[PDB]
Design a protein around this nucleic acid. Structure first.
Length: 75
DNA sequence: CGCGTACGTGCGTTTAAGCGGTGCTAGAGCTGTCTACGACCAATTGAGCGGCCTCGGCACCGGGATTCTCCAGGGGATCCGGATGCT
């Protein structure tokens, strides 16, 4: 089975936690370093990030849609 | 917009370009010869082009396969949710 991508993205945004949000390229490279097939899952990571920001668990800093930088919620 | 990177620039260092000087020569160039060669021209011809006439290679027409495209099925790959196993 294996944990879905959303928990991996939460660990990715919690890995560094610099002042600005974590970027799309940084989270892709974080998935590559932790171990993930980022090549065939671009639509997957796009829909996953949109789904998680729609819940409000993570908020958008600067960009629009899948672009920009991504940082976690208030609490 | 963001990330990775690839020059920009600013320091020092080595060097070889740059400058000044000198000798030698080999080729540039000028002059004289003269011989090979091209221009010109009378005469005349055979190749080169207009005219013409036929015909088969080809442009148009039509019928059938094949490959490209697109769409539908649908399959399945793996995922997002989740059902849930079981822990």
């Amino acid at each position: 089975s294996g944990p879905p991508v959303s928990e991996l993205i939460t660990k990715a945004v919690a890995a560094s936690k610099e002042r600005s949000g974590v970027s799309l390229a940084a989270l892709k490279k974080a998935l590559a370093a932790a171990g993930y097939d980022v090549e065939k899952n671009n639509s997957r990571i796009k829909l996953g990030l949109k789904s998680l920001v729609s819940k409000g668990t993570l908020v958008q800093t600067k960009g629009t849609g899948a672009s920009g930088s991504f940082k976690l919620n208030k609490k």
